[PDB]
Write a protein that binds this DNA or RNA. Structure first.
Ligand SMILES: Nc1nc2c(ncn2[C@H]2C[C@H](O)[C@@H](COP(=O)(O)OP(=O)(O)[C@@H](F)P(=O)(O)O)O2)c(=O)[nH]1
Ligand SMILES: [Cl-]
Ligand SMILES: [Cl-]
Ligand SMILES: [Cl-]
Ligand SMILES: [Cl-]
Ligand SMILES: [Cl-]
Ligand SMILES: [Mg+2]
Ligand code: NA
Ligand code: NA
Ligand code: NA
Length: 326
DNA sequence: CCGACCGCGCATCAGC
DNA sequence: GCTGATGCGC
DNA sequence: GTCGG
């Protein structure tokens, strides 16, 4: 919040570029500036001061000078007044509606929540559940509720098979006092990089959580990734908890550290870390870190016995999860 | 300059 | 049906 | 939009 004015401006510009211009690289450029500035431990006094930071260049520097002098940005003022952009930006807030679908909807004269509700027939399944819980998915989850959700998910998984390990990642693992959703990393000994010795490993867990009415809707579901919706049980006479987004990723057990590194994020931290890896001659995904040969082709998986080994390979000092919130 | 910008699972589609 | 490309989201 | 080579 020290430079919250500026970082908000940049995020709004990032959202415009992604959602309206469908200019993903511009979007990442703005997100990176916002992130580098959000970290900066001083109140920024000028564009020039900002430009010293990596990811802030001439254009962003100029915008920061405008914002500092006036408290706003004319380019944004105009975007906000523009009915087509505003409509498109709005629709992309429904889970399952991206920039392409949002613009297709807007072309058909579907531009508001009212329009979406009356055209459910035009929605795929994901989009439909996104609209259903539109309000709910806007709400943050207090850590206290995440703690109760953890407890249900770990206990239910334990009931299915005591050899499962379920680990809550995302901003929760980074120590955040609230989270946008719940991310669960799942492992079982019978699923490794070498073999899948049991089928339905994810499904059974999903089933048990549906059984006890924790998981209420499914956005998508494959052998290793579940994306859907869950809700804490509420007591007699009390209002229901909001429904919440839940993702569950089943990862080969021998690839736990790469998987927990990935699912811990943040997303920007993952991008930055993977890009540094490339500079160091490695590539990192949620499974492995592999060397790039002279060609630039991934070699074989390097050995990894902790998250710190991954940091070590790319010559970064270890960062605890709570310092990875970029 | 100017190329590169992280890496991937699932749903949905086109084209065979 | 298949594979490959694209959208979307993590 | 920003950056490194
Ligand atoms: N490589 C890579 N990894 C990505 C990306 N997006 C998400 N991830 C990873 C890290 C994130 O913590 C994790 C969960 O993705 P989330 O979108 O849940 O992110 P979180 O850190 O939990 C917070 F945004 P919150 O949910 O609290 O509001 O998934 C991406 O674009 N690239
Ligand atoms: Cl772009
Ligand atoms: Cl503004
Ligand atoms: Cl690993
Ligand atoms: Cl891999
Ligand atoms: Cl931590
Ligand atoms: Mg999350
Ligand atoms: Na800079
Ligand atoms: Na969306
Ligand atoms: Na998530």
């Amino acid at each position: 919040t020290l430079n919250g004015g500026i970082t908000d401006m940049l995020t709004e510009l990032a959202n415009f570029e992604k959602n309206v211009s469908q200019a993903i690289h511009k979007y990442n450029a703005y997100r990176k500036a916002a992130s580098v500035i959000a970290k900066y431990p001083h109140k920024i006094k000028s564009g020039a001061e900002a430009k010293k930071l990596p990811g802030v260049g001439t254009k962003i520097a100029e915008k920061i000078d405008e914002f500092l002098a006036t408290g706003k940005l004319r380019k944004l003022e105009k975007i906000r007044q523009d009915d087509t952009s505003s409509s498109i930006n709005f629709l992309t807030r429904v889970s399952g509606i991206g920039p392409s679908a949002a613009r297709k909807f807007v072309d058909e004269g579907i531009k508001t929540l009212e329009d979406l509700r009356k055209n459910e027939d035009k929605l795929n399944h994901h989009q439909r559940i996104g609209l259903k819980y539109f309000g709910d998915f806007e709400k943050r989850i207090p850590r206290e509720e995440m703690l109760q959700m953890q407890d249900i998910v770990l206990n239910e998984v334990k009931k299915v098979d005591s050899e499962y390990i379920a680990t809550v990642c995302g901003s929760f693992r980074r120590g955040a006092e609230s989270s946008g959703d719940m991310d669960v990393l799942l492992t079982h000994p019978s699923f490794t990089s070498e073999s899948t010795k049991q089928p339905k490993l994810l499904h059974q867990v999903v089933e048990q959580l549906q059984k006890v009415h924790f998981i209420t809707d499914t956005l998508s579901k494959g052998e290793t990734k579940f994306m859907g919706v869950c809700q804490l049980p509420s007591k007699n006479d009390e209002k229901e908890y909001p429904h919440r987004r839940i993702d569950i990723r089943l990862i080969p057990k021998d690839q736990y550290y790469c998987g927990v590194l990935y699912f811990t994020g943040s997303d920007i931290f993952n991008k930055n870390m993977r890009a540094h890896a490339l500079e160091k001659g490695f590539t990192i995904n949620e499974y492995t870190i592999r060397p790039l040969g002279v060609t630039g082709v991934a070699g074989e998986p390097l050995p990894v016995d902790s998250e710190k080994d991954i940091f070590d390979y790319i010559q970064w000092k270890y960062r605890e999860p709570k310092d990875r919130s970029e």
